[PDB]
Design a protein around this ligand. Structure first.
Ligand SMILES: [Cl-]
Ligand SMILES: [Zn+2]
Lengths: 21, 30, 21, 30, 30, 21
């Protein structure tokens, strides 16, 4: 999930984009 | 759950910008 | 207080409303 | 006090929405 | 780095207001 | 830096102003 993935480690703009439609 | 609730608020914020018109989905699930 | 109450535990929309006028 | 200062910012944010026209009061006191 | 990334977001926010027209500079460097 | 300075301790409005142009 984004939380487990982006709240323990700073997600980059590209990792964030994986959660886009 | 607070530190995590705080973090998520920022996530959504960052998804809104990154994705733009694409829109996005946010699922807090485990 | 709201802090001691809502920063150690996620307050729900209803717990938050207790701080409304 | 920082983690707490960060949290409060979100609290106020959430009070603004929840309460709407009702307005709200924020007292950081102990 | 997250708690720090969260904090910075608020910093910039607070610099924008405090400094106003003066503008401001944000350097996350060590 | 502002981070090391303002994320370990709550910077006041005056400490924040030091980062203004
Ligand atoms: Cl935060
Ligand atoms: Zn925040």
């Amino acid at each position: 999930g984004i939380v487990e993935q982006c709240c323990t480690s700073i997600c980059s703009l590209y990792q964030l984009e994986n959660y886009c439609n | 759950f607070v530190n995590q609730h705080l973090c998520g608020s920022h996530l959504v914020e960052a998804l809104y910008l990154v994705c733009g018109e694409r829109g996005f989905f946010y699922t807090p699930k485990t």
